[PDB]
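Quick question: what would this complex look like in 3D?
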Amino acid sequence: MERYENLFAQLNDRREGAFVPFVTLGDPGIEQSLKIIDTLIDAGADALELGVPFSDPLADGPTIQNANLRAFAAGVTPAQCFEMLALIREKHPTIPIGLLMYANLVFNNGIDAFYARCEQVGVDSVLVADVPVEESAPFRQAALRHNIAPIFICPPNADDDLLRQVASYGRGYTYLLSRSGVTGAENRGALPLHHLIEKLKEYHAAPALQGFGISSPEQVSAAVRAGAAGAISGSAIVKIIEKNLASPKQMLAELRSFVSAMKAASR
Amino acid sequence: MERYENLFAQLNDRREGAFVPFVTLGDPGIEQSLKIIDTLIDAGADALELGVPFSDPLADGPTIQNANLRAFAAGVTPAQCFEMLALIREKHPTIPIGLLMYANLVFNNGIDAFYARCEQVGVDSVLVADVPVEESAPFRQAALRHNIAPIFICPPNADDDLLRQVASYGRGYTYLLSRSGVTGAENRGALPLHHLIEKLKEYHAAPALQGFGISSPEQVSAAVRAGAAGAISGSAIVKIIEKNLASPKQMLAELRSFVSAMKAASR
Amino acid sequence: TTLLNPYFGEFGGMYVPQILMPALNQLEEAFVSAQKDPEFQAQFADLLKNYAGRPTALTKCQNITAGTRTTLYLKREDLLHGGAHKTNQVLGQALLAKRMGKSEIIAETGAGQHGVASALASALLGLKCRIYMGAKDVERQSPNVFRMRLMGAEVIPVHSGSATLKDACNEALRDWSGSYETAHYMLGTAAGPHPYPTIVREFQRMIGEETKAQILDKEGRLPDAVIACVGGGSNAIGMFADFINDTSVGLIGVEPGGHGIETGEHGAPLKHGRVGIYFGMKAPMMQTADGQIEESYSISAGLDFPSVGPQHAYLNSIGRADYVSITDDEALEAFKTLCRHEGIIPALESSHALAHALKMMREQPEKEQLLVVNLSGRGDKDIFTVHDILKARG
Amino acid sequence: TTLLNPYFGEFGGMYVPQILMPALNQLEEAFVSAQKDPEFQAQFADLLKNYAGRPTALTKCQNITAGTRTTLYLKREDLLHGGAHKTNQVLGQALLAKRMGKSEIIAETGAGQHGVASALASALLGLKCRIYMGAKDVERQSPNVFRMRLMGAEVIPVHSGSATLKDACNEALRDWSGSYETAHYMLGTAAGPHPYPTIVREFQRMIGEETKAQILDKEGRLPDAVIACVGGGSNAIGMFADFINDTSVGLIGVEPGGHGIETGEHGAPLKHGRVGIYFGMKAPMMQTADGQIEESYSISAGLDFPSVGPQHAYLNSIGRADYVSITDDEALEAFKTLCRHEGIIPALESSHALAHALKMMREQPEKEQLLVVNLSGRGDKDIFTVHDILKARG
Ligand SMILES: O=P(O)(O)OCCNS(=O)(=O)c1ccc(OC(F)(F)F)cc1
Ligand SMILES: O=P(O)(O)OCCNS(=O)(=O)c1ccc(OC(F)(F)F)cc1
Ligand SMILES: *Cc1c(COP(=O)(O)O)cnc(C)c1O
Ligand SMILES: *Cc1c(COP(=O)(O)O)cnc(C)c1O
Ligand SMILES: [N+]
Ligand SMILES: [N+]
C-alpha cells in the first residue's frame, strides 16, 4: 500500500502538518487500549505510532517504561498485539499505522516472518529502536519485501554520510530526533535544524516527523514551520492514560481534548 | 622460722606422710573460706597450700578456675588475702602455710615487698606457678631474704640438670608433679618415679610432696610408699566446696570427712 | 563503519539506538589508539602491578588431586585488589575514559562486584561514578552497596522491569544515550555492543598471558585445558585469549546449571537458550518463547547476566571452546572441598569452574591431565549463603 | 639454658610453668635449625610466593597527599591470601610444626583473623587444627568462626575469666601443657614466651625486606619513617626489623587510643600501662592497680591483645622506635579517607597507622617526608562497624 505517501500528499494539499500520537498497545488493557486508539483517531490523529510491550525498552523514559509495565500487568503479548492491529486496520482503512519495536521481538522467530505478519494485519511501517542504520540491512530488506516502510532515525548531529543513508534506506517518513536521550515529555528538544530538514529534502528522503519531548501545541506548529511534515507525541499522551487510570471516561475526554489541540496546531 | 623442717621431722618420727589440701583464699567468701580452712586443719591437714585469686590462672584446670571466679564474685583482693593469712597464722602457730601465686601478683608492686608482706603475715613458702627455675633468681633470692621457702616444681621427666637445680634452689618441700597438664581431679597422674624421688634425696633436696590429680586415699598411701614425704590435693577439696555452695553446714561436714580419710591414708 | 570487526561469526554487532553510534565509534577509536600507545600501556601496567597486585599467583592444588593423575593449578584472581578479576578491566576502562577527556563513569551491576570495581577505579583516578543496580539487588547486596558508597559512588536503584541486572543494563544505556559527551559507560563483562566484548577481552588477557608463562615455568608445557566460569564471559575470555592459537589447549567454559537444566531454573543461555538481540548484541540469551528477556538463576549471584559474550558463542560454534554446566549443589561441594583441603575460600562463581575440574578428575582418575581453573574471585561474600544451606542440611 | 637470647633488654623471658620448658626449648632448637636449612627456607619461600601471593605491592597514594610535601606509600599486606599479614608467619610456624613431627595445631584468637590464618595454613599442610576463642568473641565474630569451621578447624569457646582473648591465650597454654608431645602451639603475635617473639619477627620480616627493596626501586632512598599499628606487635616488627640498623629511618608504632587515653578505655599498654608478667613474658600490660590483667579496648577488634611484644618495649626504651596512639574517631576518619580517595578499604587496625601518617602530613604540610604505612589488612570485615557509626552520625 501507499498510506504515508497518500497522507502526506493530502496534508500538503491542505497546507497542513501531521500530528501522530504514540501509545503502547494494550495499555492499560486490550479493550481500553482499543477505545483509546479510536478516540485518538476521532480527535484528529493523522497516523499512529504503536508500541508492542517489551521487557527491556532501552530507548524509553519512565512514562513509557510504565506503559509497557501496565500492558504486561494485563497479560499483553505480541500475538494479542497483532490481533489488535488487525482489528484497528479493519475499522480504519487509510490511517498510517507504524509500530515501535525492539529488535528481539522482530528477530525472535524470524525477521521475514515478522514483516509478513505486519503486512497481513495492514501495518504500514516499523521502527526498530535498537537497530541503527549500520545493522539495518536484514530489517529494511524484509520490510520492503513485505510492503512495510522501515523507519530510520536522523539524530540532531547527523553527518552527511548518515543523512544520505537515512534518506536512501528509509521510507514512509524520516524520524527526526529532537535531542539525544530517551523518550519523555519532561525533556524538551530543539527546533529542528533547518539544515537537516533541508539536506533530507535535498536527498529526497521520506518526509520528516519530529519526535521526542513534543508535548505542546507550540512545538507542533514550530516543527511544521521549520519544514518538518509533522510531529510525534508519545509521553504526553501516555501521561493522560497514567493520570486517569481510575476514570476511563475522563481518560478518553482528556485524550480527545489534548489530541484535538495538538492537531489544531498542525494547520 | 622452720615450720616445714619441724613438720617433716615430726612426721618422720611418727613414720607418717603429710597430707596437704589446697583451697583458693576467699572462695566462696572471706568468712566461709576462714571456716573452710579451720575445718581442714581440725580434720588433720598437716600443712596448707593457699591460692590468691588471679585473673589468669594458666596452670589450673576448670575446678580451680571456677574457685578463682567465685572468689572474684565475692570481691576478694590480694590485700584481703593477706589479712586472711595474718588471721590464720594467729590461730594456728605451727602449721606450714604455702601460697600458690602467679608471677604478676608477686612482681606487681615489687618482688621484694611481696616476700616481705609474706614474712609479716607468717607465710612459710611461695610457689610461683609461671616462673620456671630458669627465671627464678629474683624470686628465690627475695624469698630467702625474707625467710620464705621458694617452692620449685620437679616434672615427671626431669633430667639431671633440672633435678640438681630444683634440689639446690628450693626449700621447704620439693613439688613433685604427678603428670603434665594442669590441675584437676579428673586426670590421675602416675606413681612417683622412684628414680626422681631417690635422685632428689641424693641431692639433699627439700622433702617431696606429690601433687596434681590426687583425689583418693589410695593415692596418698601410694605417694608415701614410693618415698614422697606426702601428697597435695586441690581439685578434690575444691569440688566439695563447689558441690555444697547452697549448704555451708554440709560443705564443712563433707570437707571434714574427706580430709580425715585422706590424712588417715598417710599413716 | 568501524575500525575493528564488530562480529565474531554471526554473533555480536552494535544493536544500539542510532543516537549512541557516535559514542561507540568514539570509544573504539580511543581504544585502538590506546592499544598502540606505549604510555597508555605503561600507565595500565603500573596500576595493575602496584595498585591491583599483578601478577597473581598460580597455585598448585596437591591435596585435592591426591591419588589421581590430575595436576590442578588455580589462577589466583581471588588475590587481586577488590577480590575478583573485575578489577583488571575497570582500570583499563577508567584510563580510556580519561584518554577521551570524560570526567564521569556510569556502571551497571547485579551482585555488586562490578559496581565495587568501578567505584574503586573511579576513586583512584578522580572520576565521578554513578552505578545503576536493580532495586531487588540493592536490597540483597547491602555489603557491596555500602562499599560503593564508602568509595564515593552514587548508587542508583532501578525499579523498572524485573528490578535486577538486565534492568540496570537498560538504565545505564538510557543515561549514556543522553550523557555520552561527558560520561563513559564502564560495562562490566565481555558482552554488549562492539567495541565492549573486544575491549573487555584485551583488558583481561593478562590472566591467560600470565597463566601461560607460569605454567611453562613450573611444568615446562602448556595445560591440557583451562577452565573458567561464564556469567557474561570476561574472566573466561581473559583466561582463554592467549591460548586460542594453541590448538592443543582445551578451553572449557562453565555456565551455571542452577537447580538443573531440566528445571528451567539456570543461567546457561549459551548451551540452553536461544539467539536473540538485546543489550547491543546478537547472542544466545535467556528469553521467553515470545522473545521477552528473562533472568539467569544461579546460587551464585554473580552468574546473573542473562546472555553471554558473543566471542564465547562464536568459539563454541567453531568447536574451539566447549561449554558445560554445573549445578548449585556441584558448586557448593567444590566450595566446601577447596576450603577444607586447600584453605582457600573461592567465590561461588569460580566454584563452578572448580566443580567441573573436580568432575574431569573424578570421572577419569587415571587420565593424565594438567588443568588450570581460573579462580576468578574470593568467597568471603558467600560464607553465609553456604552457611544457611550447609547447616540447614546437617 | 637457651640457644638465643630470650630477653630484649629487661623485657621478654620464658615465664611458663616448668612443665612447658622443654616444649619451648624444643621449639627454639627446631627454629634455629630451620633458619640454617636451605630446604626449609625454599619451602617457606615457595608457599609465600605461590600460595600467599608475595611479594605484596607497595602503592603510592597520590590523592591523599595532594598539596603537601608528604609522599606516602602503603605496603599492601591487605593483598595477602587471607586478607592480612598474619598469613606470613602461620605458614612458617606450620612448617616448623611439621619439621618437629607434630600433627596437631593449637591456636588462640580474639577477633578471629589469627584463627582463620591458622586454619588455612593447617588445611593446606595437613595438620589438625584446634582454635580457642573467648565465648564473647565467638558470639561477635560469626563470619570468622564459620571460615574456621569451613576450613576444618575445631573452634573451642572459652568461658573462663572475661571470655575474651587473654582467656583464650590461657586455655591454649593449658592445652599445650598436656599435649606438647603431639601438638604445636601456633601463637598469633610477636609476644608470649621466648622463642615466639623472635620466631614471629623472623617469619614476618619479609614485610620490611620487600618494603626496603621497593622503596629503593621507586625513590632511590630509604623512607624517612615506616608506620605500623601495634596490637601484639607482629606486623609492626615485621615492617621494622630490616630497618632497625638503618638509623636514619624512623620506626613509629601506633597503639589504639580507643575513646581517648584519659578515659582509660584504650589498648595502649606500651605507653600507658605498667610492666607486668603474664602470658610467658615480662612486658607492659593492661592491668588493675592490684595486678589483675585487663582487656584492651579499641573500635578495631584486632587490636585487643592486652600487652605488647617485648621487642617493642625494648626498642622504645632505647629510643630506636617511637610509639604513639590514635583514637577510634581518628582511625574511622582515616578509614573513610582511604576508601574515598584511594579506593582501598583498610582494616580498622591498619587505619590506626594510616591516621597517624595523615596527622604527620596535616600537622606539618610543608615538611618533606617520605613515609610508608604498613597496610596490615583489608577492611571488608569492618564495613558494617563503620556503617553502624557513620550513618548513626549523618
Ligand atoms: O513524546 P516522547 O518524548 O515520549 O517521544 C515519543 C517517541 N515514541 S516513538 O514511537 O516515536 C519512538 C521513536 C524512536 C525511539 O527510539 C529510537 F529513537 F532510538 F529509535 C523510541 C520511541
Ligand atoms: O589436686 P589438683 O590436681 O587440683 O592439684 C593441686 C594443685 N594445687 S597447687 O597449689 O599445689 C599447685 C601447684 C603447682 C601448680 O602449677 C605449676 F606446677 F605449674 F606450678 C598449680 C597448682
Ligand atoms: C561477576 C563475576 C563472574 C562472572 O562474570 P564474567 O564476566 O563471566 O567473568 C565470575 N567470577 C566472579 C568472582 C565475579 O565477581
Ligand atoms: C590482628 C591484626 C593486627 C594486630 O596484630 P599485630 O600482631 O600487632 O600485627 C593488625 N592488623 C590486622 C589486619 C590484624 O588482623
Ligand atoms: N548466566
Ligand atoms: N592493645
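Answer marked as accepted. The pocket of pyridoxal-5'-phosphate (ligand 4) is lined by residues D 84, 86, 113, 189, 229-236, 302-303, 347, 349-350, 376-377 (CB under 6 Å).
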